[PDB]
Amino acid sequence: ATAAEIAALPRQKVELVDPPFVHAHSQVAEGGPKVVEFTMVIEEKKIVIDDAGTEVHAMAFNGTVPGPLMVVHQDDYLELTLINPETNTLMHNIDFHAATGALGGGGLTEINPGEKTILRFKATKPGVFVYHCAPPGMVPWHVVSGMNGAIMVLPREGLHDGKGKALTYDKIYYVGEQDFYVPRDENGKYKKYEAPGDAYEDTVKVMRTLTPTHVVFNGAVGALTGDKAMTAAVGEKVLIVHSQANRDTRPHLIGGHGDYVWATGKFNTPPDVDQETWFIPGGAAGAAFYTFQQPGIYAYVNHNLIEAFELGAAAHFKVTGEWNDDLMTSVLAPSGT
Amino acid sequence: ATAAEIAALPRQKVELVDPPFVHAHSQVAEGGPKVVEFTMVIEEKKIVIDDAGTEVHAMAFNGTVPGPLMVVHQDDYLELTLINPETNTLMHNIDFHAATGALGGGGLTEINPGEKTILRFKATKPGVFVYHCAPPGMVPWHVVSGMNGAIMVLPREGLHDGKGKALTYDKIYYVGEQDFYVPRDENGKYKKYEAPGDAYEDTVKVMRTLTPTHVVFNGAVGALTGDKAMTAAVGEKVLIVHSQANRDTRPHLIGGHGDYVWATGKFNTPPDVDQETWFIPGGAAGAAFYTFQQPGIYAYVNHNLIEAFELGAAAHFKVTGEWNDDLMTSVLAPSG
Amino acid sequence: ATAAEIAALPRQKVELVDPPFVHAHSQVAEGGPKVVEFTMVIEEKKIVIDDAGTEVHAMAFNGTVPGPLMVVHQDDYLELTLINPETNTLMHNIDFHAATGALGGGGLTEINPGEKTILRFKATKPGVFVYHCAPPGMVPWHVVSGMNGAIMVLPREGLHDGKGKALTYDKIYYVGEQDFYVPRDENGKYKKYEAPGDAYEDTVKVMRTLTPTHVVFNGAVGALTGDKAMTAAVGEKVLIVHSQANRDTRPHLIGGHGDYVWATGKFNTPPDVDQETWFIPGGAAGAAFYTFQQPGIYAYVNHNLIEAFELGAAAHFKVTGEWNDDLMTSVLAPSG
Ligand SMILES: O=N[O-]
Ligand SMILES: [Cu+2]
Ligand SMILES: [Cu+2]
Ligand SMILES: [Cu+2]
Ligand SMILES: [Cu+]
Ligand SMILES: [Cu+]
Ligand SMILES: [Cu+]
């Protein structure tokens, strides 16, 4: 398309919502290509990542870890206004794995505190894709400080299974998984720091062990539990988008399955089916579609169970509806032999 | 099906066999849906896992690490009687990844020592699937103490390739891979404990390093080597089911291939073909189909070779038959 | 085929080239099956792997880490003359994951210093495959000393997508990724040794932590950058072959994609498409096909960004051509 033709396209401004929720969108594209406009302000902020009060100096797109999910359709243009407020201390940028050129956009979006930039790219390939900050020489430090999220580029005709049958979800959640590397003192207690820069050297030492201290969804241990548990109902079709910008994960819905899983995250690659546990390599997003069949509490985990239950990578679903004894029944409840 | 229809299905009791062997079954389903009944007794016991006398307080379905492979067909029911003898000291349960609801069955099967339970679930999806104990708040500890196994839910018409051609194995083995995290004292010597709970805190410390001290098949270093090597013959078709309930693995048959590999373990997902090394993520089972073409000793490994040859994740196959010089020949033997 | 049939086949001698370049070959097979002849001399040599002067005692096929890429076509025979010069100190061999029998050839190729051997195998399965040394009892040590490479067995009709459309590359590069385990002294300084055997005990200790000190392409931090940046132009189709003989990796072309990725490395397994980041398990090779659409510098990385940018797993592409503002444009350049 020419500059003139792109200029002639409809514009749509989107208001982002905080994960695990996803902004209003249509599964099947409404009309022809558009320039879909997003704005995000980067916040360097102290966050608490567990119930003990362990702090991280997060580097957060839109003030959240993960950054929010942006949704467009194939061959739309995503136009992001990225703002680095003067209250921040570091240069930041953005690399969209969905985009083509200039290191995903990073080469064109290097912004110092007090600066902004506007990047447009054509979303040529359908799928869920990681985005993350990547300042040359400081790349993993920004990413493992939480400066990453994902986008979804839906096919214009919405989702389909591997064999051309339409798949329409009732709801969608975005689970961003974060590996954190928090320095410890000689007693093994987590250290606190005044400014982000003060933590750098100690943090790099931990990073180099390739062993995170915390592995979390939505920025903290237990973030998606209690009144923040995800919800569904028997019969409800749910898409769960999962990303990990730095490190492998292996998602699993305890008590359920991934009926269709685009484990590579790319919609032109046919989904795996009937999955127990799927695999998303570091630097990617994936997506799983499931129709709930049983009510009750589910845990959604990274199925390295140490990572899930010791390090933090467990979320909950609360599911309403009628129990199905055909699918599962307690023939004899726990009772004396 | 209706209530009366479910109640009217035949019930069949099947006797289990210790891994890597698999109980007798038919690849193509015999008759209509059945309620297939299994019983397992949980054993808490000390096992030695290496050549240095290193002990683990194993928590073992049916007395083995891994627990045995249960085989049913799609749309059968699996009905397990799980027994926790009063001589045990921990509560246990079971989560079948093959099952739908109540955390895979874990929510319905929490049995204290001296208790038993019977769980039935419909095996709605074909594939190999992990099962494991998962007492809330102590999940990974039970799993990495060896309390895990797998099941196979065969398609009612048996296995097929990506094009619909039948794939019929002559034999099947179940390799359960176990990551262990054994505490050491400050001199590097592995510690021993009187009771399982005594090891809890020290073990969780090792677990949190995400670095197993041992990675083993069938519960110990060298368990599937030497006189306990698996066997085959040239021309024989072998299915190798492999599980890892907690941690990634990358199986490889040294000297062979995975001709067809359901790497995700699910039979409705078409198998990869001609595989050198396949990948099974922690929390899953996979299955590889191979026709042996050469005789001799094979090694079957997790192809992180440090895990295989330093930490214990190596098995052998002993294969009989005639050497095929077309496939491979020594044109010049090692010579000065 | 019979011995007589094989003896009648055309022979072709190949001259290997150092990675990431690949020796001259045809994508579509030229004529019927051939016996394709290769020779490699093993060099035990010191390599410097980072800008701190850190040394590894490399065990290098053809003097490089990784060893060179050998290219044949399906149902060709690969005939390798492998030489262990008297200047070396250890026994070596070679295991081809592409091969069938005798542990991939390792059982037939054990050569002491001063010995040579000739192995012929039939390349029956199309794909990219790891090869590596594997001396019994010292396997991971040789592999993590850099004694590994890969081969490509092309389909006789060259590459195709999942739907039979031809895929023809203009350029091919071979990236061998290496995990190294370098001992450190009490001050955290990397240790140096004056013979490979001297380093064994200390190196095994590091290996057992499963935590590499370095993860590198082509034997060193920054190897495939600057003078060794890989090159292309807008419109050019490039195949990137990537191997890792011991440890998982997750390749990613920063600024680009894998348009078609044989993530398992096997050409009869249909390629994934539009990949951001693909996954290659330890013990395997994979291949990605991409058509460049934008000029400029790309980084090609293992997308565990700590592994890429702290441990060394980062390469560059330098791509010439015209910028495409339709695909990407700076609407507002960084400004107050
Ligand atoms: O599927 N329970 O980890
Ligand atoms: Cu990236
Ligand atoms: Cu589980
Ligand atoms: Cu190998
Ligand atoms: Cu940043
Ligand atoms: Cu248990
Ligand atoms: Cu060697």
User: Of the residues B140, B155, B170, which one is the last residue of a structural domain?
Assistant: B155
On whether residue C3 sits in a domain, the answer given is no
Q: Identify which of C288, C281, C286 has the alpha carbon closest to the alpha carbon of residue C246.
A: C281
- Ligand 2 centroid from CA A280, angstroms: 14
CA distances for A105 relative to A113, A135, B112, angstroms: 18, 11, 57
> Is B73 marked as a binding-site residue?
no
Would you call C151 helix, strand, or coil by DSSP? strand
Within chain A, strands assigned E span 11-13, 35-48, 55-61, 70-73, 77-84, 95-96, 115-122, 127-132, 148-154, 171-180, 214-217, 230-233, 237-244, 251-254, 258-262, 272-275, 284-291, 296-302, 314-320, 328-336
How far apart CA A128 and CA C312 sit, in angstroms, is 28
* One domain, residues B17 and B62: yes
Q: What is the DSSP string of A180-234?
A: E---B-TTSPBP--SSHHHHHHHHHHHHHTT--SEEEETTBTTTTSGGG-EEEET
Neighbours of B91 (CB within 10 A): 17
On whether residue B52 sits in a domain, the answer given is yes
Question: What's the distance, CA A330 to chain centroid?
Answer: 36
Closest chain A residue to the Cα of B212, Cα to Cα: A306
On whether residue A336 sits in a domain, the answer given is no
Domain that includes residue A277, residue range = 156-322
Q: Where are the alpha helices (DSSP H) in A77-151?
A: 139-143
Number of domains within chain C: 2
* One domain, residues C235 and C99: no
Q: Please say whether the beta carbons of C147 and C67 come within 8 A.
A: yes
| CATH code, B164 | 2.60.40.420
Experimental method of this PDB entry: X-ray
Determine the Cα angle at C27 with ends B162 and A100, to 5°.
Answer: 80
How far apart CA C265 and CA B262 sit, in angstroms, is 15
Both structure tokens of A68? 């929010």
Contact C327 A102 (CB under 8 A): no
Q: Where are the alpha helices (DSSP H) in chain A?
A: 3-7, 139-143, 196-208, 305-309
* One domain, residues A135 and A210: no
- Ligand 2 centroid from CA A179, angstroms: 15
Q: Please say whether the beta carbons of B123 and B77 come within 8 A.
A: yes
Nearest-Cα distance to chain A for C188, in Å, is 12
- Ligand 7 centroid from CA A259, angstroms: 45
Contacts of A96 in chain C (CB under 8 A): none
**A77-84 and A55-61 strand pairing:** unpaired
* One domain, residues A317 and A212: yes
Of the candidates A255, A305, A306, the beta carbon closest to that of B101 is on A255
For residue C95, give the ligand nearest its CA: 4
Q: Cis link prior to A20 (omega < 30° from 0)?
A: yes
Q: Is the torsion defined by CA of B229, B230, B234, B239 positive or negative?
A: negative
**B237-244 and B284-291 strand pairing:** antiparallel
Cβ of B95 closer than 6 Å to ligand 1, yes or no, is yes
* One domain, residues A75 and A163: no
How far apart CA A30 and CA A25 sit, in angstroms, is 10
On whether residue B65 sits in a domain, the answer given is yes
User: Looking up tokens 């305890």, which residue turns up?
Assistant: A254
Question: What's the distance, CA C13 to chain centroid?
Answer: 21
Cβ of A299 closer than 6 Å to ligand 1, yes or no, is no
How far apart CA C234 and CA C230 sit, in angstroms, is 14
Kind and range of the H or E element at C307? Answer: helix C305-309
On whether residue C2 sits in a domain, the answer given is no
How far apart CA A132 and CA A104 sit, in angstroms, is 9
On whether residue A92 sits in a domain, the answer given is yes
How far apart CA C228 and CA C224 sit, in angstroms, is 5
- State this model's resolution in angstroms: 1.6
Question: What's the distance, CA C277 to chain centroid?
Answer: 18
> Is C25 marked as a binding-site residue?
no
For residue B88, give the ligand nearest its CA: 6
Q: Identify which of A110, A106, A128 has the alpha carbon closest to the alpha carbon of residue A263.
A: A128
Residue C133: active-site member:
yes
On whether residue C334 sits in a domain, the answer given is no
* One domain, residues C93 and C228: no
Both structure tokens of C105? 């050839």
Look at phi and psi of residue C124 and say left if phi exceeds 0, alpha if psi is from -120 to 50, else beta: alpha
Q: Cis link prior to B271 (omega < 30° from 0)?
A: no
Kind and range of the H or E element at B207? Answer: helix B200-208
How far apart CA B224 and CA C253 sit, in angstroms, is 41
* One domain, residues B225 and B293: yes
> Is C23 marked as a binding-site residue?
no
Cβ of A132 closer than 6 Å to ligand 1, yes or no, is no
For atom 2 of ligand 1, the residue with the nearest CA is: A254
* One domain, residues C138 and C259: no
User: Of the residues A112, A136, A155, which one is the last residue of a structural domain?
Assistant: A155
On whether residue B329 sits in a domain, the answer given is no
For atom 1 of ligand 1, the residue with the nearest CA is: A254
Question: For A190-196, which contacts have Cβ atoms below 8 Å and span 24 or more sequence positions?
Answer: A190/A52, A190/A54, A190/A55, A192/A55, A193/A55, A193/A57, A195/A57, A195/A89, A196/A44, A196/A57, A196/A59, A196/A89, A196/A90, A196/A145
| Farthest CA pair distance, chain C | 78
* One domain, residues A122 and A209: no
Question: What's the distance, CA C226 to chain centroid?
Answer: 20
* One domain, residues A195 and A97: no
User: Of the residues C102, C136, C155, which one is the last residue of a structural domain?
Assistant: C155
Burial class (CB in 10 A: 0-12, 13-18, 19+), A63: middle
* One domain, residues C191 and C114: no
User: Looking up tokens 């000739």, which residue turns up?
Assistant: C118
Contacts of A127 in chain C (CB under 8 A): 274, 276
* One domain, residues A106 and A178: no
Closest chain A residue to the Cα of B140, Cα to Cα: A305
